[PDB]
Chains A and B, each alone.
Chain A
């Protein structure tokens, strides 16, 4: 069922989503025993609104693996990219 999808979010001025999870993140509202990074909220009319959705699991960002990544490390990485953030996400279809 699940597929790895690639999307490009243009910071305008930010990505327009929140996340939960990661190593040390004490879980997420979707799959408690998955320690990965999950999108929790997408800003309507924001840069991610046609691309990402709550529940999506981010497993890569601009070539950097998000598998086994810590919670703050993922937040810092996403904050630090200055323009386009090409994401690979896992989504149930």
Chain B
């Protein structure tokens, strides 16, 4: 799955 960077 694709994980975002820190938001």
Interface residues of A (CB under 8 A from B): 14-21, 24-29, 40, 43, 71, 75, 78-79
Contacts and interface: CB of A to CB of B under 8 A. Distances in A.
B7 A71 contact: no
A19 B6 CA distance: 8
Contacts of B1: 20-21, 25-29
Contacts of B3: 18-20, 40
Contacts of A17: 6-7
B2 A16 contact: no
Contacts of A75: 4-5, 7
A71 B2 CA distance: 8
A20 B7 CA distance: 12
